[PDB]
């Protein structure tokens, strides 16, 4: 009837696919994984109707349809979700029919059918019917069809079976449309018209008569009885009920790790509830005996991070043989990350602890909760409880304020070249013997710390000057070079003047100032580092203005001098200097009178911007080569190796010898009207630095203006009175933008237009046209164009081009005409363009006189 399977992990050897047979419920989840070619699947599994947990179909290839595998899938309950999803179908490049056609309920969580490049027909299902309604935010479908089609596939019945739905159709493929159940159904039934009884889930099947049975039934099942809840002594497990002892036969798989079923509260549960633990008879839950529950694990070698992971969530480490942290791989800084993951939860190493050959390991900080090493069977004939050998890079033991009581045996430390003896001597309060000291035989004094920065004193460094691009660092500490005077306040004394090579200054740009000193990892190269400077005054240089910098100092000495000192990291900031040029300055002509200038300060300010200074300078009017006449067209270490060699030679020598353009000064608000009071020749304004648009007014019609934009920052107190501001530099550089304003309408109208005959005796009538040159033109007049027309049809209007070089000296242009009444009108042409004519003037030209009447 309802025979189950546990979880399944299907694999490319398709003989693994045969695991699905003769069980209708997967009692856990389905993974189908990396079948490189599923084509040899001759089988199908229509017996499979239900999965309790979730489906993953991941990178299956040689597979074309899920109907091929498990076509009768009717319910995925979601009694777990994978990351919130009950159905993941990911990157199945060959998957092309999502033929889950009988699928009715995904009772919890979301659906994610994506990257299946051949799976058309994904949005073509209204997944929201299949889910529970609360989950309808959790349907995700992407990359279903990068290049396969441009809407070329089609549903059943529709023209590019079922009615129209969502004003499209709902489609599993080109063949099948989404099964319904009535609105008062809820995906527990399997025809469009008449749902099953409401005790069912997914669907029901009706016998050859009319007896109706569930495919899956909702609240629980036992003996295939559709049930509200399991009877007393039957324990619920996701879908069916089980006997008490049967629960222990069950499993569920989590976090890549097995859990048994434990029968509690009338349920199988994979974990006892928080504050309870699995009983000793592995079949019942009990309270944590201490009120806290503590996973107990077995001691062994930890040769690799991939091994260290096995301890995750362990709290007690147990067994007759030492936990042995032996990360021989020079892995580097991630060693602490995986070790912290593996071991940070340990309370108690019963076995004693060994730390051997490990390269990457900086410290035992990763035992972030270790508080006892009970040493019930300590190493080397119970002699040592904590054995720390050959650890090249180990230089710290436990965390700050970390206590770890060691009950039995001593501690053995050798060949840890960076582990300072004075750090090992922090364990003295921690042994049960509370011993006064460690013997040479336990803690080798020459074997530990012979390259640690041990006994480091503290230097005080002060920023004695600053620039925009430089700084002076002075080491204020009385570092005494050569032996002291006894009363001296000598903080550190280098007993040999030449053992001290110099101070080394470290600095970096660090806006937050939360940086910390460089570790000994040469890949930790966050810091610029000076040559050693023996004066202790270093003028840092080429700094970025107004930038938060951090710096620190250490003394550098030959490898065999144990005196050393080192500052904390100190923070400072450079002066703001000169703010960068303003950007995007564009000038657009509005009219003959107005300009809109747009800009935005993209490059960074230094300090705080205080003003944008806008200045417009009127360029001279244009002028053009009238000799190139254009009536035709006016229109518009060795620090050790060589030093030590020097030391011992000089010692040997001495033993032998002695045997008994507008400078920003000018940036000020201005108005400079021209003499006519009509327009500006200069305009300037110190706009608020919040504004990046400016509108000019009363500009001279048709002229080019140069436009600055300048961003300025506040002056520093030392500048405004100690520099006397003479270095200035408060204000940016600028680029001269230009714009030409616009032509003033009708400004080129010739005024006072008059036309008359001269009275001198003539045969061809001397018509004189007079005017005054335009009083305020759009720039220099090229020519006047006079247009005149005899006032009848079939006449073209004549035009003459008269250079402006003629009209004043003529004081009136003279034209010859004969009998007729003529239109006259005139316009000037500027080098800006043709003007607009006057209204038409008229003249009656009288006829050539005659006397033969």
């Amino acid at each position: 009837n309802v025979k189950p399977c546990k979880s399944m992990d299907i694999r490319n050897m398709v003989s693994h696919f045969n695991q699905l047979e003769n069980c209708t419920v997967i009692e856990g989840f389905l993974l189908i994984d990396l079948i490189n070619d599923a084509s040899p699947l001759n089988r199908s599994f229509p017996k499979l109707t239900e999965v309790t947990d979730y489906i993953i179909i991941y990178r299956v290839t040689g597979l074309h349809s899920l109907s091929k595998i498990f076509p009768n899938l009717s319910v995925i309950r979601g009694n777990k979700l994978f990351d919130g999803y009950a159905l993941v179908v990911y990157s199945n490049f060959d998957l092309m029919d999502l033929g889950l056609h009988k699928l009715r309920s995904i009772t919890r969580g979301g659906v994610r059918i994506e990257k299946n490049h051949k799976l058309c027909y994904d949005r073509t299902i209204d997944w929201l019917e299949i889910l529970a309604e609360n989950e309808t935010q959790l349907v995700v479908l992407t990359e279903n069809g990068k290049e396969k089609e441009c809407r070329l596939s089609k549903c059943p019945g529709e023209i590019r079976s079922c009615q129209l739905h969502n004003n499209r159709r709902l489609c599993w493929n080109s063949k099948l449309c989404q099964t319904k159940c009535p609105e008062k159904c809820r995906n527990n039934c399997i025809d469009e018209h008449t749902c099953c009884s409401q005790d069912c889930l997914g669907g029901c099947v009706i016998d050859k008569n009319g007896n109706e049975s569930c495919i899956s039934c909702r609240n629980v099942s036992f003996n295939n009885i559709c049930m509200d809840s399991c009877p007393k002594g039957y324990y619920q497990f996701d879908s069916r009920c089980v006997t008490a002892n049967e629960c222990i036969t069950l499993t569920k798989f989590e976090t890549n790790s097995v859990y048994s079923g434990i029968p509690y509260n009338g349920q199988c549960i994979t974990h006892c509830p928080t504050g309870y633990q699995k009983s000793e008879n592995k079949r019942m839950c009990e309270p944590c005996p201490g009120g806290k529950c503590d996973k107990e694990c077995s001691s062994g070698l930890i040769d690799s991070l991939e091994r260290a992971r096995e301890f995750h969530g362990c709290t007690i480490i147990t067994g007759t043989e030492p936990l042995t942290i032996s990360i021989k791989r020079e892995s580097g800084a991630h060693v602490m990350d995986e070790l912290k993951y593996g071991l940070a939860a340990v309370h108690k190493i019963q076995s004693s602890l060994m730390v051997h050959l490990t390269y990457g390991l900086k410290s035992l900080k990763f035992f972030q909760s270790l508080t006892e090493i009970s040493g019930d069977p300590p190493m080397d004939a119970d002699k040592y409880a904590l054995y720390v050998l050959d650890n090249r890079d180990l230089d710290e033991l436990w965390g700050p304020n970390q206590t770890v009581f060691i009950r039995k045996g001593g501690v053995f430390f050798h060949f840890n070249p960076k582990l300072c003896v004075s750090t090992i001597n922090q364990l003295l309060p921690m042994l049960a013997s509370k011993p006064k000291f460690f013997e040479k035989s336990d803690v080798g004094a020459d074997s530990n710390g012979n390259r640690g920065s041990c006994g480091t004193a503290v230097l005080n460094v002060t920023l004695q000057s600053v620039g925009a691009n430089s700084a002076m660092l002075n080491v204020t500490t009385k570092v005494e070079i050569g032996e002291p005077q006894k009363p001296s306040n000598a903080t550190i004394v280098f007993k040999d003047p030449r053992a001290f090579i110099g101070f080394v200054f470290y600095h970096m740009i660090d806006p937050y100032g939360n940086s910390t000193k460089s570790s000994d990892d040469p890949c930790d190269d966050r810091w610029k580092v000076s040559s050693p400077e023996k004066s202790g005054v270093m003028v840092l240089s080429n700094l970025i203005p107004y930038t938060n910098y951090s710096y620190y100092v250490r003394t550098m000495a030959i490898s065999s001098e144990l005196t050393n000192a080192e500052s904390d990291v100190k923070n400072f900031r450079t002066n703001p200097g000169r703010p960068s040029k303003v950007t995007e300055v564009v000038a657009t002509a509005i009219s003959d009178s107005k300009i809109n200038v747009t800009w935005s300060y993209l490059d960074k300010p230094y300090g705080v911007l205080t003003r944008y200074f806008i200045k417009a300078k009127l360029i001279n009017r244009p002028t053009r080569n009238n000799n190139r006449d254009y009536c035709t067209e006016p229109l518009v270490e060795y620090d050790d190796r060589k030093v030590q060699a020097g030391m011992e030679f000089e010692n040997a020598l001495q033993n032998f010898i002695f045997v008994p353009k507008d400078d920003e000064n000018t940036y000020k608000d201005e108005e400079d009207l021209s003499s006519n009071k009509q327009f500006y020749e200069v305009f300037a304004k110190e706009l608020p630095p919040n504004q990046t648009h400016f509108v000019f007014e009363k500009l001279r019609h048709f002229t080019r203006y140069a436009i600055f934009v300048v961003a300025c920052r506040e002056e520093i107190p030392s500048e405004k009175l100690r520099d006397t501001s003479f270095k200035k530099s408060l204000c940016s550089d600028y680029d001269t933008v230009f714009q030409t304003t616009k032509r003033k309408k009708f400004a080129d109208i010739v005024m006072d237009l008059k036309v008359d005959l001269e009275h001198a005796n003539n045969t061809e009538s001397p018509v004189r046209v007079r005017w005054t040159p335009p009083v305020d033109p759009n720039g220099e007049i090229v020519t006047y164009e006079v247009a005149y027309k005899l006032q009848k049809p079939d006449q073209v209007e004549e035009k003459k081009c008269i250079p402006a070089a003629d009209f004043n000296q003529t004081a009136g242009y003279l034209i010859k005409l004969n009998e007729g009444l003529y239109s006259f009108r005139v316009r000037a042409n500027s080098i800006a363009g043709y003007g607009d004519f006057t209204e038409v003037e008229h003249i009656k030209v009288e006829p050539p006189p005659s006397y033969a009447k």
Binding site: S7, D9, R11, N12, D33, S91
Partner: peptide
């Protein structure tokens, strides 16, 4: 040796890492 592989570039490296398959949960 600087694997750094991620996503499909990791899948294509795990399948570069053996001719046989991988998955062996609860088996």
């Amino acid at each position: 040796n600087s694997l750094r592989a991620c996503g499909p570039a990791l899948m294509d490296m795990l399948r570069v890492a053996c001719p046989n398959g991988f998955n062996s949960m609860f088996a």
